[PDB]
Amino acid sequence: AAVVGQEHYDVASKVQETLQTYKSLQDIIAILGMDELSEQDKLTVERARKIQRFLSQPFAVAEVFTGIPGKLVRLKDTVASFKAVLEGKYDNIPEHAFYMVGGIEDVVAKAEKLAA
Amino acid sequence: AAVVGQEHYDVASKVQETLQTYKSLQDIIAILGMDELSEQDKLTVERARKIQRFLSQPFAVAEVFTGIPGKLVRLKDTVASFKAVLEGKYDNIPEHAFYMVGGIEDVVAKAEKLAA
Amino acid sequence: PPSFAEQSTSAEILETGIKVVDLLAPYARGGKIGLFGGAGVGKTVFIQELINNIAKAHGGFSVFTGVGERTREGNDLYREMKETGVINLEGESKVALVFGQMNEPPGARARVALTGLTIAEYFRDEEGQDVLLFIDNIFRFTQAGSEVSALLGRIPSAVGYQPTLATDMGLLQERITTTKKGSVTSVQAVYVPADDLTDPAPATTFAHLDATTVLSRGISELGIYPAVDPLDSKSRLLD
Amino acid sequence: YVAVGQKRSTVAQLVQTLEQHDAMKYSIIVAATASEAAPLQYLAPFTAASIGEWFRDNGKHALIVYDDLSKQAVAYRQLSLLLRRPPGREAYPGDVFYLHSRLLERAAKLSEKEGSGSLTALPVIETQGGDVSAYIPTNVISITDGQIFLEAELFYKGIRPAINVGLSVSRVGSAAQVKALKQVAGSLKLFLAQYREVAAFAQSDLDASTKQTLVRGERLTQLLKQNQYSPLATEEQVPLIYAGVNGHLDGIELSRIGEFESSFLSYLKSNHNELLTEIREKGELSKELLASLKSATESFVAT
Amino acid sequence: YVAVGQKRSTVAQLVQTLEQHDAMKYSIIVAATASEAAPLQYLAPFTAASIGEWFRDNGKHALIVYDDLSKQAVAYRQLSLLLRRPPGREAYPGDVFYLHSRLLERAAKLSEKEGSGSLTALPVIETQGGDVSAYIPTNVISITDGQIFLEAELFYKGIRPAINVGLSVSRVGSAAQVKALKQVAGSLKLFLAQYREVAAFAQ
Amino acid sequence: YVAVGQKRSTVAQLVQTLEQHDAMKYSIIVAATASEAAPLQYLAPFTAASIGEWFRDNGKHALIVYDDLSKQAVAYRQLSLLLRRPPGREAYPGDVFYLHSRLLERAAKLSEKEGSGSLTALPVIETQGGDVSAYIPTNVISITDGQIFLEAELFYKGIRPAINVGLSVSRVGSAAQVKALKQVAGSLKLFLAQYREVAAFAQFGSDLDASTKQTLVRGERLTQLLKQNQYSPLATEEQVPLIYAGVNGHLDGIELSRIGEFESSFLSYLKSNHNELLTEIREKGELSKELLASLKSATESFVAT
Amino acid sequence: LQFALPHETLYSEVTQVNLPAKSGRIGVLANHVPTVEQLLPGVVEVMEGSNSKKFFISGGFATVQPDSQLCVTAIEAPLESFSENIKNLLAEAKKNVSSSREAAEAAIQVEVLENLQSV
Amino acid sequence: ATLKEVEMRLKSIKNIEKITKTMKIVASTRLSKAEKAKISAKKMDEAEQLFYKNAETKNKELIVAITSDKGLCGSIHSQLAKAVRRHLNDQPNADIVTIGDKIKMQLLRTHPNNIKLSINGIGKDAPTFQESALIADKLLSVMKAGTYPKISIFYNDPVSSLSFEPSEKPIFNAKTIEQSPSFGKFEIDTDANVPRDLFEYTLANQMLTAMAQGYAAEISARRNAMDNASKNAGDMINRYSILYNRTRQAVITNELVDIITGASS
Amino acid sequence: MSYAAYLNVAAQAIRSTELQTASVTNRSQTDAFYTQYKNASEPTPMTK
């Protein structure tokens, strides 16, 4: 926090708790699947799976492997983006939208593209 | 039996069978709760748990750890109380009453002191 | 081993006369067949059948080699063979027996496979036949080769096997093959350590097998004889 | 009885136990106790092996218990390493197999020409946390004609002897059984096999078929508990295994199977000593003897 | 075609089927079968390397196939353990990497100044119960320009050639491929590679 | 503070922080960094043990942090393999145990005749993949008077310090706790165990009763109440009322995300108002019966905002 | 088809049905008036030309349909080939409970019981 | 990834796969038992409700939710609670009584002050009229049933074995019954509270049918779910088996090396 | 009991050693419990 500041600090931790929880359940979901999770658990997973896909980023140098021209997001850009997702402000968006795109603007774009 | 008598040997064997069963059932308890059980079983478990605790005991040496006074139990008192426990002559008393106490005197003493 | 010149250019089925085998898991001529299963599955009866059938249908002898033999079973086999008359003290035999039992020291147990193989290799080159060479058990040959390595004070390889393990197998297996003169086909009992198909021993062995014949307890219990599992026993020559 | 690397006080007590059963008079203890030089612990089983063969070679029969081979292998190891012979898996020399093969291959049934004598072998092998893949157990398992398999799990359940049936085999098997015991038990391995497969069904709504299977199994398993030191005569086994297999205990509750055996046998002794005598003497069961036992059972079970 | 640690029988039939398709006329085969000496099976890929290297040098194109490196590595473990060098992971000598690295580094494309000859390594690793993470495979993957991981589970279901997509990658050919196909296969890769994790959340 | 096998800048980054906290005036760092000779690395802890043995011998109390023994052993392995002494398990020397045992025994609490000086040791040990059953950790684990296990899983889900209560012990125990802390911490550690118990049974997601839901609510809040930011050690009298509020269940009807704000808001108020308690707890270290009263009142008061 | 207990459903074509209605016994027939009536705790009977088969019952509902199908629904139910001492010993405990909301339920037993005695 | 771990890890999965495979086969027999009570209840639904077909009765709302207390049966409760919220959009202030906890838990989280009563100890055995009457009774008792403008029971209908269906069905009350268009056709003697009874007994009967169908839909689900658990733990076992052998294997080599090196010196 | 249940006391006085083989003996044993719910919080427990 002394370096990145309380918010970036907290958007981080909360992202990690989310991912760590998804990780803890990897076993129940492996055998029982999703239907046996509670309600709060169930959400975290759908959210974590979104955070997870959102952490992926097209690289310009790796273009000959994605096909999609690469993106560079900024620090202030990234934190806001993730904070919004962690406030569930995007829950209503197909998990796929979060995959391999830039910042939060690119998510709303791709989701409109696919919802057509 | 040749060394300790039959009764001692029988109590000692049954206590062992009890706990062995209770150990064997810990799969079905985790997965399908305590709900999904035969009635004899439900009782065997009830008795096994009561028994687990009656096997602990405050040592004098370890007062620094329990703040509980050291209790020493006579061998005949051991066998009698376990015998009693085993035949169900104590099924009403709560689990905690057997934990960190001496002889069956102390089980009764605690049972009441707590119900107060 | 017969040079790259003396090689068979085509793979070819050896007829055994057994329906299950020929239809589902057909044998290579001059090929190597991993035979699987312990007791209670008529292993020796089945072996004797092939010795008989390779002799009767084709017209070639058989050499049964006991590598790491339990002696009890050597006495059984030998008697059972006489009783079945594949051995004929009075008339003619169809099979030569080369035993190298457990009690024998590691050197002995390593070489017996070759001892027998040599004998079989005579009937393919001198008499130009299609001979059966049996090896029971190809694993204990491996085992033995390990002990020799340890005693010779060489550094164990991975999982304690002989550093030489591949080439050791090669030297053996590469003499078991088709020539223009004839062929030696081998049926080799295969034990699998800790039920682990990835253990160096079977790993390295499968590298030479062309067909597995798996007899099964489930199959004998259903009354089916031979107790070959129709589904498991797979031949890599069924193309 | 070849005692290897045991506490002397144990051996002493094993002696004091056979003398308490008048068994010493026909037993030999070769003792290579915990504290003795490794060579002696290495040697003892071969040493005792040659003692057995005396009987084998002389038209008689011995049986030899190696307690245990685990500790013999440990001993051989000590010698080798110290002699700086090169080590392999777990620091055993290459010829640790050859050690045990040599030992156990000496056991046999000799042919008529040899006096038809015999030597039987009971090597003891100590697993560690149940590891049959462990180096030594592997070797030995692959030398022997089978295993009697013990498990502390079964033991704390109270099933003593604690024999895992599913894991125990005797490659010799059929051929070595009092024909009479083999007569009323070809079904026994069958029943206990199917009882192992429907076992987890012991926890509310089971159909009468798999209900029944659980009814035999518990009783049967109970019937094979046996207090220490009290081995049963064949003519004393076959009745109990008969009443069991042919369903004369399904009526009886599972706790009474204890006192059942005691009272059955003493009753059979007084009121049917003649059938017992035929089993002990003929070693087989007549079509008549089967109706004899059947009748005597149905009479005791009714009573 | 280098034939490292193979059978004499396997090679025969492999030549037969190369003559049956006429491809013999334009191909050289070097083989060091499972009987031959450890240092033969070890030296084989290298000598094949030079044989191919001639073409890459005299302005032509050659395709070398190392079948396989896992059996070559194993021959090396042989010598190395008989020469009493310490065993590393899976009893392999510390230099087992350098073996393959210094080999593959020869398969190569030349500059316009050196005739533009080319030599194309198709080494073959063989894994164990599907294990990519193993000490040999990793070494070779950390040497090569990608890998075509063939998964058995697919091949058992009749999918042939059983290429696992999310575990195969060409590293430098996605700029070497024929235009026509690249145009018509827009992203096809991660389509199928992320199609596998989805259909595996249905049952 | 003994730096063993650390990179230099990392010892720097650290003495800076000590100074940023005016903590350097009472410390002595002893450094055997990454680049120094194996012999110096191996030696440091011993030399250091002596530096602070001075304090113990002379009536004072030092605290020695060995950060960390896994590396000292890595280096001690290096002297030996190169001196050609034949190796033990994982190539370590045969007496790699003796190595640590003799160091760690040098920590002790002297008798009155000898000046009552103490030396206290916090060795550090780094595992791999959570395995505590590897050679060295095992060695030291049985040498010391207890351990604190930190865990990565705990960390990432927000328990920081990522202490593992389940596995951490102090074998001295309550003998070294402050009486006040002891009094209100009665049974907490056992309870926190029972809590993991009920939380494992919770995974069955089968309906809870008023007893299990009860202990779940408290355990969750207790867990949360022990979380703590780096660089912020608390006075005993700040700790005590927190623990008391949690244990006697005054926190149990408060949102989980809000327990953060509870802590400082509580302390703020206690300083402001009932400072006379806070100063007694401190001065006396023991909650007398009336002090439990004032505190009892004081907490209830505040929980109603 | 149309005469059901919740655990066991019974009948299917009918020539005469006798029922114990809300107000006294009644008899449905080949064509009858569409009616609903509470079924009192008493005997019933089916017909198939000249076929006598009487059941007891707990009570419920009858419903003669416009389409002419009669639907009869009760809870529990052969005649004397079903239900003396079984009745007697119970009747004892019944009357006893009446002298006791709880004893009100026993009032229900006396009438239901007394009825069954007549069979 | 030590050997000690991997071993016991692999055990407890085998032990799980056992239980799950027991579960499956146990459901198979239990679905056969609850198959006959879904034919004997859906038939008594015939004789009853036919009267209502002829006198076509068209309907402070009372929603009754039906499931069980049991988990381990897929989305039975999850997707029934959703159709109950789909219908609970159009009347945000409608009272609910829940039968079975898993549904109560579900709605308790989303319409937390809608529910006024709850029942439990249900989906263990096949439901009987005895229950279906006592719940109907208590619905009359505390819930003030007849005094409701409208009542609908929500249950999981069983479409096949592999699939079920969240379903709704209308209960009509005394007034609705009198007021029904063709009530006139039925010469029901106005001889004291006659439509009342028909209601009070169509509430128990309708409720039963739902419960029979709900339970037999749940049992199917439990069966199918447990079935997939066995397939997965089946596939997991396979993986860990392979991992086990690797670790074993290396344990042997790394252990051996320690000796070899000790030995050369 | 009720009217709703009228014919479940007329069927359970009329229940009470024949047909009661599983079927009816079990039709007679119901293990249900009700609990009223107030402002989240409940009211109290009781057998149905």
From Swiss-Prot, chain C:
Residues that bear Phosphoserine: 220
Binding-site positions, ATP: 37-44
Compartments where found: Mitochondrion; Mitochondrion inner membrane
Highest taxon listed in the record's lineage: Eukaryota
Modified residues (Phosphothreonine): 84
Oligomeric form and interacting partners: F-type ATPases have 2 components, CF(1) - the catalytic core - and CF(0) - the membrane proton channel. CF(1) has five subunits: alpha(3), beta(3), gamma(1), delta(1), epsilon(1). CF(0) has three main subunits: a, b and c.
Record family assignment: Belongs to the ATPase alpha/beta chains family.
Note: Present with 164000 molecules/cell in log phase SD medium.
Summary of the function given for this chain in its UniProt record: Mitochondrial membrane ATP synthase (F(1)F(0) ATP synthase or Complex V) produces ATP from ADP in the presence of a proton gradient across the membrane which is generated by electron transport complexes of the respiratory chain. F-type ATPases consist of two structural domains, F(1) - containing the extramembraneous catalytic core, and F(0) - containing the membrane proton channel, linked together by a central stalk and a peripheral stalk. During catalysis, ATP synthesis in the catalytic domain of F(1) is coupled via a rotary mechanism of the central stalk subunits to proton translocation.
Name of the featured protein: ATP synthase subunit beta, mitochondrial
Organism whose genome encodes this protein: Saccharomyces cerevisiae (strain ATCC 204508 / S288c)
Record lineage: Eukaryota, Fungi, Dikarya, Ascomycota, Saccharomycotina
Residue window of the full protein shown: 154 to 392 of 511
Curated annotation (Swiss-Prot), chain E:
Keywords: ATP synthesis, ATP-binding, CF(1), Hydrogen ion transport, Ion transport, Membrane, Mitochondrion, Mitochondrion inner membrane, Nucleotide-binding, Phosphoprotein, Transit peptide, Transport
Record function comment: Mitochondrial membrane ATP synthase (F(1)F(0) ATP synthase or Complex V) produces ATP from ADP in the presence of a proton gradient across the membrane which is generated by electron transport complexes of the respiratory chain. F-type ATPases consist of two structural domains, F(1) - containing the extramembraneous catalytic core, and F(0) - containing the membrane proton channel, linked together by a central stalk and a peripheral stalk. During catalysis, ATP synthesis in the catalytic domain of F(1) is coupled via a rotary mechanism of the central stalk subunits to proton translocation.
Name of this protein: ATP synthase subunit alpha, mitochondrial
Molecular-function GO terms, alphabetical: ADP binding; ATP binding; proton-transporting ATP synthase activity, rotational mechanism
Phenotype for residue 52 to D: In ATP1-2; growth-defect
Coiled coil segments of this chain: none
Site (Required for activity): 168
Residue window of the full protein shown: 240 to 442 of 545
GO terms under biological process: proton motive force-driven ATP synthesis
Subunit note: F-type ATPases have 2 components, CF(1) - the catalytic core - and CF(0) - the membrane proton channel. CF(1) has five subunits: alpha(3), beta(3), gamma(1), delta(1), epsilon(1). CF(0) has three main subunits: a, b and c.
UniProtKB/Swiss-Prot annotation, chain G:
Cellular component, GO annotation: mitochondrial inner membrane; mitochondrion; proton-transporting ATP synthase complex
Keyword Mitochondrion attributed: yes
Location relative to the cell: Mitochondrion; Mitochondrion inner membrane
One MF term in the entry's GO annotations: proton-transporting ATP synthase activity, rotational mechanism
Keywords, alphabetical: ATP synthesis, CF(1), Hydrogen ion transport, Ion transport, Membrane, Mitochondrion, Mitochondrion inner membrane, Transit peptide, Transport
Function per UniProt: Mitochondrial membrane ATP synthase (F(1)F(0) ATP synthase or Complex V) produces ATP from ADP in the presence of a proton gradient across the membrane which is generated by electron transport complexes of the respiratory chain. F-type ATPases consist of two structural domains, F(1) - containing the extramembraneous catalytic core, and F(0) - containing the membrane proton channel, linked together by a central stalk and a peripheral stalk. During catalysis, ATP turnover in the catalytic domain of F(1) is coupled via a rotary mechanism of the central stalk subunits to proton translocation.
Name recorded for this polypeptide: ATP synthase subunit delta, mitochondrial
Gene symbol of the encoding locus: ATP16
UniProtKB/Swiss-Prot annotation, chain H:
Compartments, as annotated in UniProt: Mitochondrion; Mitochondrion inner membrane
Effect on the protein upon substituting residue 163 to I: In strain: D273-10B/A1
Cystine bridges: none
Effect of residue 259 to T: In ATP3-1; dominant suppressor of the slow-growth phenotype of yme1 strains lacking mitochondrial DNA
CDD domains, per database record: F1-ATPase_gamma
GO BP term (any one): proton motive force-driven ATP synthesis
Molecular-function GO terms, alphabetical: proton-transporting ATP synthase activity, rotational mechanism
Description of how the protein assembles with itself and partners: F-type ATPases have 2 components, CF(1) - the catalytic core - and CF(0) - the membrane proton channel. CF(1) has five subunits: alpha(3), beta(3), gamma(1), delta(1), epsilon(1). CF(0) has three main subunits: a, b and c.
Biological role: Mitochondrial membrane ATP synthase (F(1)F(0) ATP synthase or Complex V) produces ATP from ADP in the presence of a proton gradient across the membrane which is generated by electron transport complexes of the respiratory chain. F-type ATPases consist of two structural domains, F(1) - containing the extramembraneous catalytic core, and F(0) - containing the membrane proton channel, linked together by a central stalk and a peripheral stalk. During catalysis, ATP synthesis in the catalytic domain of F(1) is coupled via a rotary mechanism of the central stalk subunits to proton translocation.
The protein's name: ATP synthase subunit gamma, mitochondrial
Organism of provenance: Saccharomyces cerevisiae (strain ATCC 204508 / S288c)
Gene name of the record: ATP3
